[PDB]
Amino acid sequence: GDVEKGKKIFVQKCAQCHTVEKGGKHKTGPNLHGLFGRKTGQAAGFSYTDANQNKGITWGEDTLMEYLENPKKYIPGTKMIFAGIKKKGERADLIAYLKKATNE
Ligand code: HEC
């Protein structure tokens, strides 16, 4: 994936609901710092659905690749109202961006 392309995707498709930085605010969706290795539904201070709390997976490259294609298919009942990113390359770029931005 291409980090710079992924940054642009994040701004267009994600940033209205999510921050990535350490100490960034929860918004409509949870702050995503530490995403890689985070268990579903475990960010303190965010009110998740039971569906997101109970999915029982660890976020990382492949679980994110699947989720982001079609969130509701991966986590039925999620309150993340986002249809998905259909192009594999776009998902890969976004994930590469997230891997950097959620760790910095
Ligand atoms: C607002 C309209 C959203 C947009 C646009 C995106 N996300 Fe989101 N996300 C949102 C909510 C309300 C939640 C919680 C859902 C629930 O059912 O409780 C989420 C959740 C995620 C998660 C899971 C995080 C966890 O701690 O388990 C991830 C990884 C995530 N969102 C990522 C993400 C990305 C990368 C987006 C752009 C493609 C994106 N979301 C858009 C709300 C909104």
Residue numbers in the entry: 1 to 104
Describing publication, verbatim:
Cytochrome c (Cytc) is a globular 104 amino acid heme protein that orchestrates cellular life and death decisions. It functions as an electron carrier in the electron transport chain (ETC) and as a trigger of apoptosis when released from the mitochondria.
As the cost to grow enough xenografts to obtain preparative amounts of Cytc for functional studies is prohibitive, we replaced the lysine residue with glutamine, which mimics acetylated lysine. This mutation (K53Q) converts the positive charge of the lysine side chain to a neutral charge, similar to the effect of lysine acetylation seen with the acetylated protein in vivo. The electron density for Q53 in molecule B is better defined because its side chain is immobilized by a hydrogen bond to the carbonyl oxygen of Y40. The side chain of Q53 in molecule A interacts only with a water molecule within 3.5 Å. Of the new mutants studied here only the K53Q Cytc mutant crystallized and gave a high-resolution structure at 1.31 Å that showed good omit map density for Q53 and confirmed that the mutation caused no major structural disturbance or unfolding at its location, although there is a moderate distortion at R38-Q42 due to crystal packing. The experimental results showed that acetylmimetic K53Q and K53I Cytc resulted in a lower oxygen consumption rate compared to WT and K53R Cytc. Interestingly, acetylmimetic K53Q and nonpolar K53I resulted in significantly 80% and 87% reduced caspase-3 activity, compared to the WT.
